[PDB]
Design a protein around this ligand. Structure first.
Ligand SMILES: *C(=O)[C@H](CCSC)NC=O
Ligand SMILES: [K+]
Ligand SMILES: [K+]
Ligand SMILES: [K+]
Ligand SMILES: [K+]
Ligand SMILES: [K+]
Ligand SMILES: [K+]
Ligand SMILES: [K+]
Ligand SMILES: [K+]
Ligand SMILES: [K+]
Ligand SMILES: [K+]
Ligand SMILES: [K+]
Ligand SMILES: [K+]
Ligand SMILES: [K+]
Ligand SMILES: [K+]
Ligand SMILES: [K+]
Ligand SMILES: [K+]
Ligand SMILES: [K+]
Ligand SMILES: [K+]
Ligand SMILES: [K+]
Ligand SMILES: [Mg+2]
Ligand SMILES: [Mg+2]
Ligand SMILES: [Mg+2]
Ligand SMILES: [Mg+2]
Ligand SMILES: [Mg+2]
Ligand SMILES: [Mg+2]
Ligand SMILES: [Mg+2]
Ligand SMILES: [Mg+2]
Ligand SMILES: [Mg+2]
Ligand SMILES: [Mg+2]
Ligand SMILES: [Mg+2]
Ligand SMILES: [Mg+2]
Ligand SMILES: [Mg+2]
Ligand SMILES: [Mg+2]
Ligand SMILES: [Mg+2]
Ligand SMILES: [Mg+2]
Ligand SMILES: [Mg+2]
Ligand SMILES: [Mg+2]
Ligand SMILES: [Mg+2]
Ligand SMILES: [Mg+2]
Ligand SMILES: [Mg+2]
Ligand SMILES: [Mg+2]
Ligand SMILES: [Mg+2]
Ligand SMILES: [Mg+2]
Ligand SMILES: [Mg+2]
Ligand SMILES: [Mg+2]
Ligand SMILES: [Mg+2]
Ligand SMILES: [Mg+2]
Ligand SMILES: [Mg+2]
Ligand SMILES: [Mg+2]
Ligand SMILES: [Mg+2]
Ligand SMILES: [Mg+2]
Ligand SMILES: [Mg+2]
Ligand SMILES: [Mg+2]
Ligand SMILES: [Mg+2]
Ligand SMILES: [Mg+2]
Ligand SMILES: [Mg+2]
Ligand SMILES: [Mg+2]
Ligand SMILES: [Mg+2]
Ligand SMILES: [Mg+2]
Ligand SMILES: [Mg+2]
Ligand SMILES: [Mg+2]
Ligand SMILES: [Mg+2]
Ligand SMILES: [Mg+2]
Ligand SMILES: [Mg+2]
Ligand SMILES: [Mg+2]
Ligand SMILES: [Mg+2]
Ligand SMILES: [Mg+2]
Ligand SMILES: [Mg+2]
Ligand SMILES: [Mg+2]
Ligand SMILES: [Mg+2]
Ligand SMILES: [Mg+2]
Ligand SMILES: [Mg+2]
Ligand SMILES: [Mg+2]
Ligand SMILES: [Mg+2]
Ligand SMILES: [Mg+2]
Ligand SMILES: [Mg+2]
Ligand SMILES: [Mg+2]
Ligand SMILES: [Mg+2]
Ligand SMILES: [Mg+2]
Ligand SMILES: [Mg+2]
Ligand SMILES: [Mg+2]
Ligand SMILES: [Mg+2]
Ligand SMILES: [Mg+2]
Ligand SMILES: [Mg+2]
Ligand SMILES: [Mg+2]
Ligand SMILES: [Mg+2]
Ligand SMILES: [Mg+2]
Ligand SMILES: [Mg+2]
Ligand SMILES: [Mg+2]
Ligand SMILES: [Mg+2]
Ligand SMILES: [Mg+2]
Ligand SMILES: [Mg+2]
Ligand SMILES: [Mg+2]
Ligand SMILES: [Mg+2]
Ligand SMILES: [Mg+2]
Ligand SMILES: [Mg+2]
Ligand SMILES: [Mg+2]
Ligand SMILES: [Mg+2]
Ligand SMILES: [Mg+2]
Ligand SMILES: [Mg+2]
Ligand SMILES: [Mg+2]
Ligand SMILES: [Mg+2]
Ligand SMILES: [Mg+2]
Ligand SMILES: [Mg+2]
Ligand SMILES: [Mg+2]
Ligand SMILES: [Mg+2]
Ligand SMILES: [Mg+2]
Ligand SMILES: [Mg+2]
Ligand SMILES: [Mg+2]
Ligand SMILES: [Mg+2]
Ligand SMILES: [Mg+2]
Ligand SMILES: [Mg+2]
Ligand SMILES: [Mg+2]
Ligand SMILES: [Mg+2]
Ligand SMILES: [Mg+2]
Ligand SMILES: [Mg+2]
Ligand SMILES: [Mg+2]
Ligand SMILES: [Mg+2]
Ligand SMILES: [Mg+2]
Ligand SMILES: [Mg+2]
Ligand SMILES: [Mg+2]
Ligand SMILES: [Mg+2]
Ligand SMILES: [Mg+2]
Ligand SMILES: [Mg+2]
Ligand SMILES: [Mg+2]
Ligand SMILES: [Mg+2]
Ligand SMILES: [Mg+2]
Ligand SMILES: [Mg+2]
Ligand SMILES: [Mg+2]
Ligand SMILES: [Mg+2]
Ligand SMILES: [Mg+2]
Ligand SMILES: [Mg+2]
Ligand SMILES: [Mg+2]
Ligand SMILES: [Mg+2]
Ligand SMILES: [Mg+2]
Ligand SMILES: [Mg+2]
Ligand SMILES: [Mg+2]
Ligand SMILES: [Mg+2]
Ligand SMILES: [Mg+2]
Ligand SMILES: [Mg+2]
Ligand SMILES: [Mg+2]
Ligand SMILES: [Mg+2]
Ligand SMILES: [Mg+2]
Ligand SMILES: [Mg+2]
Ligand SMILES: [Mg+2]
Ligand SMILES: [Mg+2]
Ligand SMILES: [Mg+2]
Ligand SMILES: [Mg+2]
Ligand SMILES: [Mg+2]
Ligand SMILES: [Mg+2]
Ligand SMILES: [Mg+2]
Ligand SMILES: [Mg+2]
Ligand SMILES: [Mg+2]
Ligand SMILES: [Mg+2]
Lengths: 112, 29
RNA sequence: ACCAAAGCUAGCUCAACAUACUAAACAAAUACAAAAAUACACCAAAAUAAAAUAAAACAUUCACCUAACAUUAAAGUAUAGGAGAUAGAAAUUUUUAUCCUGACGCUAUAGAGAUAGUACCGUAAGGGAAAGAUGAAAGAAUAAAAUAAAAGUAAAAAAAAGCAAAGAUUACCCCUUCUACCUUUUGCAUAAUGGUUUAACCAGAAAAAAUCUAACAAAGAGAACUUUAGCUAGAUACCCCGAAACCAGACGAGCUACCCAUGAGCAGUUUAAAAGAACCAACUCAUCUAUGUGGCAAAAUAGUGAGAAGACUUGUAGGUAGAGGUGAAAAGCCUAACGAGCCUGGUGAUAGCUGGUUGUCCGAGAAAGAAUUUUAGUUCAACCUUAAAAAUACCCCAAAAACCCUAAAUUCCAAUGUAUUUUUAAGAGAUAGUCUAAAAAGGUACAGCUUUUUAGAAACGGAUACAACCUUGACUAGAGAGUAAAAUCUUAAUACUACCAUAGUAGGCCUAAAAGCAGCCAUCAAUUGAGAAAGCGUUAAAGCUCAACAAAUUCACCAACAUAAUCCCAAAAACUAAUAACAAACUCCUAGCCCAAUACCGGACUAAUCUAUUGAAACAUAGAAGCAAUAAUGUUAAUAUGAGUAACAAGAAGCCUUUCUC
RNA sequence: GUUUACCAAAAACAUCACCUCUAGCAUUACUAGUAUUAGAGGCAAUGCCUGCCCAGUGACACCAGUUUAACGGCCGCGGUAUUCUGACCGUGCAAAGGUAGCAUAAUCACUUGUUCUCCAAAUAAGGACUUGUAUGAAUGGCCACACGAGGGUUUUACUGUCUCUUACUUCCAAUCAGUGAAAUUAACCUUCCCGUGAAGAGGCGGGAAUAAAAAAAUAAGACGAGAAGACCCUAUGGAGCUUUAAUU
RNA sequence: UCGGAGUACAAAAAACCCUCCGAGUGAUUUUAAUCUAGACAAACCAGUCAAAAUAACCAUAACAUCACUUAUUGAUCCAAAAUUUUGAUCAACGGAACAAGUUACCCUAGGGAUAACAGCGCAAUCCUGUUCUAGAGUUCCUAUCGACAAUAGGGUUUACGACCUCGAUGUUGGAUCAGGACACCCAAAUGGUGCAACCGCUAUUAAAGGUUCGUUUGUUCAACGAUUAAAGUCCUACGUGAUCUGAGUUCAGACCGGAGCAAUCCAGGUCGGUUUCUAUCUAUUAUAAAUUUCUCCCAGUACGAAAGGACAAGAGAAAUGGGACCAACCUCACAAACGCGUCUCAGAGAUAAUUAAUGAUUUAAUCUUAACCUAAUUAACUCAUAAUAAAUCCAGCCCUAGAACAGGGCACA
RNA sequence: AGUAAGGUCAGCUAAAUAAGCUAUCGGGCCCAUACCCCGAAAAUGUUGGUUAUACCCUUCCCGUACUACCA
């Protein structure tokens, strides 16, 4: 007969994880890009409008499993928490960047 | 080449045939 | 020993100088149909060049391409361009005369086409060759000297067997081992392409950026420019053959289509007929068949046919010319090819397409991701080559990477093992893939099928033969040695035989009839022993047999599956001792010059020419190029094979030229 | 009568006839003519006929409009007389809805339609039946005389066409004498069978056969020789023809 | 062209004329600024995020939101608008500023990279055999058949793939000559039967020989007439055109119907239409030892209620095929050749299915991949037998011998 | 096979404002029937989705239509 399926061709968006644990990253480097929320941002990690994770401070990237406390203004998320049984807590994975360089140091500029 | 599952007792690779012949069952004597 | 071989002149090429540029010969005849002494005339003319090509198509555009007055610079700048391809000035600058001119140009397939625009092929425009060799004397031809070396033959035919050879061997064969060579492909002994063989001739060319060497250096360069180590100079580079076509100008209607002039043919026979009537010759066309097919003939011969007083055949001569002529339209004919002639010029037209591409040796060495009137091609990325700089590359433990279920396993990373990797500067090729194992998809859970991902391979050994499977780190020499993959695969299977039968009772029900034996229901009971029945049978009965008596005691689940076409296919073998043996490009042993390859790239040497200096029985260091041919249905010339084969011709006798036969 | 000189001589073209169209006129055609003339075309004598349609296109008028012997066109759905058929009726669209005639034809397919005659036997031939839903009226329909190197069928007569080949002559042929060519050719010391293999082997593998040469024959193979396949596809390769392609 | 899910199971990437959903924009107001560290992605062109800093406004305020939110889009040049800015189903969506048909009148460069014919691969389709019995067969599975299903093999048909050939592998049917297979049509032997006999149905074994002549069609096929012991199936480049045929397909001409405004087109029909080759090599160029039908007879017997009606054995005559010959007839104008005419044509061994005897494993029985002996029994095949037979005159002439070369005669002829 | 394309009252048409004609049903006129006049009833093939429906899309079903070519 004839083909009925159309438009199935599309290149991948290269969504995935960029920096593994232990990689030394600087401020602005994109830790990971994702379609849905696969890894939630953690300490010293921002979040762009396209749900990409970028480090805010120079340091070492670390991955961690932590608890999830949703924003009360998010109606869908708080509803899921409400229906949970008393003995359960949500767990999500997070990406952290432990700072390495200190904020600054004091040096002698003038001795009057 | 043929599929993984066929209807005609797919002929094994010659190296695999030696494997099937050296791993036979020898009943105790 | 024939055929052949050798020679160095003829002359030519590119300049320079230069008079200033249609030669030589013109007695007579020369534009009547040229080379024919002699009569009232006409005579003459101009209209932009177009296109093949480039823009990967093609419409605007496309250098030079008729007419510039040059050189050093301004400058490939200003501008003009489907602003694409490419096209491209000027203002303003520079330039000292005459001699010193000859040759790192050829030597008879070269150099002009040339011994010559002559032979010869074309009606015409036009195309256009091959061809020379003695010596001081050939007024030394019983003449002399020289290579006796190409293919092809002769001297001298051949003796089983094989890409014609190698290993050898006392010995030519006999033995053993080897699927011609290029091109083109995933893969060719292939029955895919090309070549009969020999000689001669025939195909890589450019310097912007770069690397190597050198001069001078914050400056370099013999003006005009470039400059934050640069500038100047040298060296290192990019082919040949081929279309159908397109445009312009010439020459062709002596063949043929049609027409205008001027002529010439149609006998007999039949009819008041010279009626596009009738029979049949000359004459003109060419229906059918057979010979012929490199033929007698680039369209014919033999037989047979149609017209034959007309819209008919035919001679001479003239007219219409390619964007056209002509046509009783067949897209016919216009000089043996006309969906539009031929010749020359534009022309070395242009081809992503086919074929070809000439010495030795050595180093490293790539199968496809993305766009594309693009998938027969290009331009990028990856990979790779040459040179250079730098520091980290592979392997990589623990930790770490998602939410319903989910395998093999990947990503990332210290150690460790090992030398690899990145960056910078130059680059081309490739971008048409085949199978095996693994995970999938389409299909017939078909294909030597097709589309992707991971991995492997493309032995001169093994699977008899064999691109893809297995053994293998591809050097040279040896008449040494150890080993790896590996050589005939299993079963071809099933005997089951004694003895013996009687009770209630045709159990109830059911049905035409149901007596163990359609069905329903129940399944008790005599006898030590035997089921209200396991099978067969009867319309229903009867009857046979099997369970139970006794007798008696090898073992007994299961395992059976037709055939193809030229002629079956190593020969053969059940036991003398087997973790044997024989067996490679692997690995040891003795010496070394110390490890394969297609496209592309790198390096070292070198045959033969000329020139600058050496050399002086034929070379050395350098500088230059018409610098190397087993392959283009290659060119010219010469040789073979087919083959002494196909095919060709003269009537007889005699007294020789006269009589006979047709 | 004419045509594809060199594979088609015909059913093609031409042709007398009929019809449409354009032109009122002078020194080179038409024409030394003047609408009973002359050109641009169609269709094919004669005979009987040539039906309906200017909506579209074209032409004319160049305005309304007029023209089909100008290019061209010339219909559905549903019901209805016991059954069948459909005179008739409802409804819709059109510029009109295929009229006369002929017909399984040279006429898509169905197709070897059905039937009769011809034959011992008929996918042939002739005569009828006939929606041919794709026949059809000067892109002409239909009928007939004569004519035809056109195409098909039948009877009669003849015969080597054939059942079934044979005899004898001439040109070829083979031997002798003379002259002496062509396509072709990688090298060949040039076998058969099965198997293998770029999938059809003289050459590889496993086996068989095997003194060497000459002359005369038959054509199975050498994917025989001949023409860089005419079929097919590809090429940002050509050309001829047509127009409602683009530019002009 | 762009996005989402599976193929792509766990970092990324990853294809098909693969399987399923979408997009070529709306609604609303929070109308969303300037400037810069660092990165994801990627051939390129493009696409994406983004701290700090400045301005805006709670006076130390930057993510427009929702619809699977992911896609909702277009490069230069050029054109228009104020200079801010805008412009394409350029959808062939990395886009030529603007361009359709047909060629069977075709041409050129190439491709077996790519089709038609043939081989090969494969077996969907096709063919052949077996396993399984529900049932058909009055009762009765398998005398003859056998649904729903199982399994093995053949390579004939139409397909599928595009692997060898497009610097050519010539293509249907006939004519000639046939080579081969057996899944056998006839001829021979045999088992079973719903087999009395006759005529049949079915199965096993056997391939030496044989398998007709005509009307229509180009036909293979098929229908029909007549006959035969039977008019087999199939392979061989659906054998065979360097042997022939060209009616059909399959060029250029021409009509009819249809499609197209036309040029032209139609696996739609009709009429016409060049069939080349001198053989280099390989291969090859005569032994025989028959086969079938019909008649008569057995016999109107066997067998059957009757109707019907045999086999074996015996005898004879023809036909085809192999190999020969002219007395006659006939072809016949040579003394010969020739058919339409005449002549001749064979014994033994050996077997397959199947049938029977003796007999053990199993003291019965049982034809025995149990032994010994022995019997009835297809065709091939093999052989008896028959043909051939002398080594070494050969110039010349003749010949019923012959292409050449050979061979037989030449004493009485 | 593929593509194209349609279904609406009993029937045929036009619109989606489901209308018009006819048929069918009731009544009147006439001696009766028909004509004629008057009144009433009647449907969007099918499934799902189209803000909600209909003209649309989708599914199912019937039937219609073109093409099937070069060797
Ligand atoms: C099929 O017809 C084709 C020829 C086309 S041109 C007559 N066959 C070729 O072999
Ligand atoms: K070839
Ligand atoms: K080729
Ligand atoms: K070649
Ligand atoms: K003339
Ligand atoms: K001649
Ligand atoms: K190309
Ligand atoms: K009973
Ligand atoms: K004629
Ligand atoms: K009109
Ligand atoms: K008829
Ligand atoms: K004629
Ligand atoms: K032959
Ligand atoms: K494009
Ligand atoms: K198949
Ligand atoms: K071919
Ligand atoms: K036979
Ligand atoms: K040969
Ligand atoms: K005779
Ligand atoms: K037994
Ligand atoms: Mg993709
Ligand atoms: Mg996807
Ligand atoms: Mg595979
Ligand atoms: Mg161009
Ligand atoms: Mg080009
Ligand atoms: Mg020009
Ligand atoms: Mg401009
Ligand atoms: Mg010369
Ligand atoms: Mg020379
Ligand atoms: Mg010589
Ligand atoms: Mg040898
Ligand atoms: Mg090979
Ligand atoms: Mg190939
Ligand atoms: Mg290649
Ligand atoms: Mg070859
Ligand atoms: Mg080729
Ligand atoms: Mg050749
Ligand atoms: Mg330079
Ligand atoms: Mg041009
Ligand atoms: Mg011209
Ligand atoms: Mg003339
Ligand atoms: Mg006369
Ligand atoms: Mg006459
Ligand atoms: Mg003529
Ligand atoms: Mg003649
Ligand atoms: Mg003749
Ligand atoms: Mg004659
Ligand atoms: Mg005549
Ligand atoms: Mg006549
Ligand atoms: Mg002229
Ligand atoms: Mg013309
Ligand atoms: Mg004429
Ligand atoms: Mg014509
Ligand atoms: Mg024509
Ligand atoms: Mg000519
Ligand atoms: Mg060229
Ligand atoms: Mg590719
Ligand atoms: Mg590159
Ligand atoms: Mg780990
Ligand atoms: Mg590391
Ligand atoms: Mg390519
Ligand atoms: Mg592949
Ligand atoms: Mg494959
Ligand atoms: Mg392929
Ligand atoms: Mg790979
Ligand atoms: Mg080997
Ligand atoms: Mg080694
Ligand atoms: Mg018992
Ligand atoms: Mg059988
Ligand atoms: Mg053998
Ligand atoms: Mg060894
Ligand atoms: Mg190497
Ligand atoms: Mg290659
Ligand atoms: Mg030198
Ligand atoms: Mg040279
Ligand atoms: Mg040479
Ligand atoms: Mg040739
Ligand atoms: Mg050559
Ligand atoms: Mg010579
Ligand atoms: Mg010779
Ligand atoms: Mg010869
Ligand atoms: Mg001769
Ligand atoms: Mg005539
Ligand atoms: Mg002709
Ligand atoms: Mg003719
Ligand atoms: Mg009239
Ligand atoms: Mg008429
Ligand atoms: Mg006519
Ligand atoms: Mg006519
Ligand atoms: Mg009319
Ligand atoms: Mg009008
Ligand atoms: Mg009639
Ligand atoms: Mg008629
Ligand atoms: Mg018809
Ligand atoms: Mg006929
Ligand atoms: Mg006939
Ligand atoms: Mg008739
Ligand atoms: Mg018609
Ligand atoms: Mg008309
Ligand atoms: Mg007509
Ligand atoms: Mg007349
Ligand atoms: Mg006639
Ligand atoms: Mg007769
Ligand atoms: Mg001779
Ligand atoms: Mg030999
Ligand atoms: Mg073979
Ligand atoms: Mg061999
Ligand atoms: Mg051998
Ligand atoms: Mg001869
Ligand atoms: Mg011969
Ligand atoms: Mg060969
Ligand atoms: Mg052949
Ligand atoms: Mg050939
Ligand atoms: Mg070619
Ligand atoms: Mg063609
Ligand atoms: Mg292209
Ligand atoms: Mg072109
Ligand atoms: Mg061109
Ligand atoms: Mg032209
Ligand atoms: Mg136009
Ligand atoms: Mg990146
Ligand atoms: Mg900020
Ligand atoms: Mg542009
Ligand atoms: Mg594109
Ligand atoms: Mg893209
Ligand atoms: Mg462009
Ligand atoms: Mg034609
Ligand atoms: Mg060609
Ligand atoms: Mg390919
Ligand atoms: Mg063939
Ligand atoms: Mg084929
Ligand atoms: Mg073949
Ligand atoms: Mg099979
Ligand atoms: Mg039954
Ligand atoms: Mg099967
Ligand atoms: Mg192929
Ligand atoms: Mg060839
Ligand atoms: Mg035959
Ligand atoms: Mg035979
Ligand atoms: Mg048999
Ligand atoms: Mg029989
Ligand atoms: Mg054949
Ligand atoms: Mg034939
Ligand atoms: Mg022939
Ligand atoms: Mg042949
Ligand atoms: Mg013909
Ligand atoms: Mg016509
Ligand atoms: Mg004829
Ligand atoms: Mg014909
Ligand atoms: Mg011969
Ligand atoms: Mg011959
Ligand atoms: Mg008898
Ligand atoms: Mg016994
Ligand atoms: Mg014997
Ligand atoms: Mg003698």
């Amino acid at each position: 007969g004839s083909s009925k399926n159309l438009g199935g061709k599309s290149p991948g968006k290269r969504f995935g994880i960029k920096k593994m644990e232990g990689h030394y990253v600087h401020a602005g480097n994109i830790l990971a890009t994702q379609r849905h929320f696969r890894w939630h941002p953690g300490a010293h990690v921002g979040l762009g409008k396209n749900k990409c994770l970028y480090a805010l401070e120079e340091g070492v990237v670390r991955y961690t499993k932590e608890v999830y406390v949703p924003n009360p203004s998010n109606s869908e998320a708080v509803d899921l928490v409400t229906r949970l049984p008393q003995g359960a807590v949500l767990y999500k994975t997070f990406v952290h960047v432990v700072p390495a360089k200190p904020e600054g140091t004091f040096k002698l500029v003038a001795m009057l | 080449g043929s599929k993984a599952v066929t209807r005609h007792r797919r002929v094994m690779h010659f190296e695999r045939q030696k494997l099937m012949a050296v791993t036979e069952y020898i009943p105790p004597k």
